[PDB]
Structure 1
Amino acid sequence: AVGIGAVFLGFLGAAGSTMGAASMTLTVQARNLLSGTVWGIKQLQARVLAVERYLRDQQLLGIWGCSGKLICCTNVPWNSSWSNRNLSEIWDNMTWLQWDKEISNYTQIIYGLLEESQNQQEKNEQDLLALD
């Protein structure tokens, strides 16, 4: 879902667009997330906070299936007790600012399942290599 258009398509440009349309511009927010006598200390701790946050997010990705995919799929199924709404009414109706609030309570339940499924898939892969 990308077409020909000459406008800049910049950082947080599609924050209000629906989340089926902001997904076609995710490398922009990924790009503009890292590079940007006493005050050098303040600037320096701001820069190390930036690189620490980037490393924490890349570590959360890396212990899951995707390390540099930027769109990755996994093997845990969507529990319908979490959001109980249709597939057609998320990708064409709501935004990420509005979808963030609706699963913020069910966040950190999902991440443990992601790590659990990735650890189980790693040990299944190790056993499948080991039986050969």
Structure 2
Amino acid sequence: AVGIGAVFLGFLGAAGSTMGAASMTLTVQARNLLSGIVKLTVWGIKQLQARVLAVERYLRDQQLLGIWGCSGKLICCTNVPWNSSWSNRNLSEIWDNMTWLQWDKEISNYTQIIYGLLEESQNQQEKNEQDLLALD
């Protein structure tokens, strides 16, 4: 669905829709991951067990954007050429069919490998952070 006011249970129908339609309203998930709906007894300690991990998982995701150069951007291009071994070079035709829930099954093995290249991509920039240009 397209729209951003919405509800977290207003957009997740895109879990079956196309990746193109799912690419819009990409912010509502980013809102929901923060806090959501959350004498001493079981629920009291559970509010400390679950809450701290909800914060912990969010930091680990923003940790990777802050390094790859995609800080604060939902969509983000990166300087990595797509190797055809990971997938065929015609996804631009295909992602009008697949949903994101189906795309993940293809890159399941290669996702940890790809993160190295994105790290390398930033370090094509980081190798260029000492030499010449920024005398200004």
Q: Map 1:36-115 to 2 at 5 A.
A: 36=36, 37-115=41-119
CA RMSD of aligned residues (A): 2.8
Identity %: 100
User: In 1, distance between residues paired with 2:11 and 2:52?
Assistant: 22
After superposing on structure 2, the runs of 4+ consecutive aligned residues of structure 1 that deviate more than 4 Å are 1-9
User: In 1, distance between residues paired with 2:8 and 2:42?
Assistant: 37
User: In 1, distance between residues paired with 2:44 and 2:14?
Assistant: 34
More displaced, 107-116 or 118-127?
118-127
The offset of 1:84, in angstroms, is 1.4
User: In 1, distance between residues paired with 2:2 and 2:132?
Assistant: 40
Segments of 5+ residues of structure 1 without an aligned counterpart are none
User: In 2, distance between residues paired with 1:6 and 1:49?
Assistant: 26
The offset of 1:43, in angstroms, is 1.3
The offset of 1:10, in angstroms, is 1.9
- The answer as to whether partners of 1:11 and 1:32 remain within 8 angstroms in 2 is no
- The answer as to whether partners of 2:4 and 2:27 remain within 8 angstroms in 1 is no
- The answer as to whether partners of 1:19 and 1:92 remain within 8 angstroms in 2 is yes
Aligned length: 132
SS in 1 for 2:23: coil
User: In 2, distance between residues paired with 1:25 and 1:49?
Assistant: 25
- TM-score, normalised via structure 1 length: 0.85
Segments of 5+ residues of structure 2 without an aligned counterpart are none
